[PDB]
Design a protein around this ligand. Structure first.
Ligand code: SRM
Ligand code: SF4
Ligand SMILES: O=N[O-]
Ligand code: NA
Length: 455
């Protein structure tokens, strides 16, 4: 189990060839696994620090990888936002945190980084194509304990707006308040989401302003329209293009007839710019001169990196789980493909094959696969059994309530077949499945997680 500090998921082609070699000759699995926190993992490491440090990479400290929207519609905004994600990352590097701390830099209208699963969030605010500040959202966290109503997933709370110059002092202030006010006794209550609920958002906020040496201004408008990656070619700035490759489960391995790993090595060798690991476990070959599109595209196409999948598969995600995770209760990564094969059939059957439902499977309640922010979330309870949650939304600002408990795939399928059926026929124009289950009364919404997540 090795993981890199790779703020924003940006990794160079030189660094890629380095992790490609190691994965292939120094691990049991021989794969590169892209995670949903924009970094990679090796599985079955049989020194890695030298191999990493040589290409200017390092393994992480309760601070996890700082995320940054990978492919903003306003392509010019990435450079600055990424610069800030990298600054915050080095600035937060070693104080001890009671529990781990997760941070992101979001570029609206995209919430691909899933900000509500994190402790500290900086929503970029730009004027005239220039970043002028950030709206600070604090307190997200998805981890729960089965049957423990004292634990809960919570969404981030808005603190206010801050000029760009106050970024680092604000980041440090949230970290330190949390550290000092974190529950000293129990670790399962040491998360920021718990502290906020204990002391209150305004109380925590006031302390943060006090320590930062600032006063938050009112939140500046921002909205999100989605969380998915922009699969395929999208036009960037100047004459450059970005090809985002869909990688199922983010598992990069050479499969028979689908040399995904070799393909990425090949592309890495001729690629101008760099790669960007997305929060959806995909990979962006970034900054391809228009003149190179055909080269890059030929390789990706031949390697099976560009095989078309349904929009459903592109918006589905699962955590690692078995065989490498020790906390795994049920399959996640290894269950998703055939499970989505079934969901695909179901989407076809109802005439919604062009639609998608943000569907996630987390191997255990720790919540790594972010099922607690999905429209349809599966939380492993035991081998082959999951709790089925429903009612989240496409943009990821609502926690889905438990709908069915400790059920098997055949039972999960039967339930979705019926629900998807009702959605395909009764939904309003452009209405997502999640919002639909809530509107149709299939599931009560979770309006205040700390108080109404559990029935
Ligand atoms: C790889 C990944 C899932 C995936 O398929 O993408 C994953 C994998 C693991 N996570 Fe995670 N988590 C992953 C994203 C997250 C997320 C989602 C996110 O951050 O966007 C969450 C939910 C949000 C949250 O933290 O509230 C998450 C919450 C946890 C927790 C529960 C934390 C808590 O507050 O209780 C644990 C267990 C722990 O550390 O307490 C954990 C533990 C683990 C470990 C490291 C198991 C361990 O403790 O030894 C898992 C390693 C499995 C393996 O064999 O590789 N992981 N984990 C992601 C790696 C992130 C990274 O590179 O830093
Ligand atoms: S959610 Fe559970 S099973 Fe999945 S990777 Fe995280 S700790 Fe392991
Ligand atoms: O890697 N789990 O936070
Ligand atoms: Na993926």
């Amino acid at each position: 189990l090795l993981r890199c500090r790779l703020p924003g998921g940006v990794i160079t082609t030189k660094q890629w060839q380095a992790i490609d070699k190691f994965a292939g000759e120094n691990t049991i699995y021989g794969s590169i696994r892209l995670t949903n926190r924009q970094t990679f993992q090796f599985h079955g490491i049989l020194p890695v620090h030298q191999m990493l440090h040589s290409v200017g990479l390092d393994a992480l400290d309760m601070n996890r990888n700082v995320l940054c929207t990978s492919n903003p519609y306003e392509s010019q905004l990435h450079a600055e936002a990424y610069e800030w994600a990298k600054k915050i990352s080095e600035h937060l590097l070693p104080t001890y945190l009671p529990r781990k701390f997760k941070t992101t830099v979001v570029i609206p209208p995209q919430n691909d980084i899933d900000l509500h699963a994190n402790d500290m969030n900086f929503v970029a605010i730009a004027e005239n194509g220039k970043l002028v500040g950030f709206n600070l959202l604090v307190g997200g966290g998805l981890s729960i304990e089965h049957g423990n109503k004292k634990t809960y997933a919570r969404t981030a709370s808005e603190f206010g707006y801050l000029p760009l110059e106050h970024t680092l002092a604000v980041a440090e202030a949230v970290v330190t308040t949390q550290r000092d006010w974190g529950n000293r006794t129990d670790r399962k209550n040491a998360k920021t989401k718990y502290t906020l609920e204990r002391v209150g958002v305004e109380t925590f906020k006031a302390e943060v302003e006090r320590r930062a040496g600032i006063k938050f201004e009112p939140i500046r408008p921002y909205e999100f329209t989605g969380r998915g990656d922009r699969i395929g070619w999208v036009k960037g700035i100047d004459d450059n293009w970005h090809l985002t490759l869909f990688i199922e489960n983010g598992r990069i391995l050479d499969y028979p007839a689908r040399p995904l790993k070799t393909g990425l090595l090949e592309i890495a060798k001729i690629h101008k710019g760099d790669f960007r690991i997305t929060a959806n476990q995909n990979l962006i070959i970034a900054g391809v001169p228009e003149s190179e599109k055909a080269k890059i595209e030929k390789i990706a196409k031949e390697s099976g990196l560009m095989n078309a999948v349904t929009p459903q598969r592109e918006n589905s995600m699962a955590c690692v789980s078995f065989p490498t995770c020790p906390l795994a209760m049920a399959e996640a990564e290894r269950f998703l493909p055939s499970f989505i094969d079934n969901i695909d059939n179901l989407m076809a059957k109802h005439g919604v094959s062009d639609e998608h439902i943000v569907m996630r499977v987390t191997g255990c309640p720790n919540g790594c696969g972010r099922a607690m922010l999905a429209e349809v979330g599966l939380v492993g309870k035991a081998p082959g059994r999951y709790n089925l949650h429903l009612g989240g939304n496409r943009i990821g600002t609502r926690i889905p309530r438990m709908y069915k408990e400790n059920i098997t795939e055949p039972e999960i399928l039967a339930s979705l077949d019926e629900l998807i059926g009702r959605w395909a026929k009764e939904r309003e124009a452009g209405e997502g499945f999640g919002d639909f289950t809530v509107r149709a009364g299939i599931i009560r919404p979770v309006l205040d997680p700390a108080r109404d997540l559990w029935d």
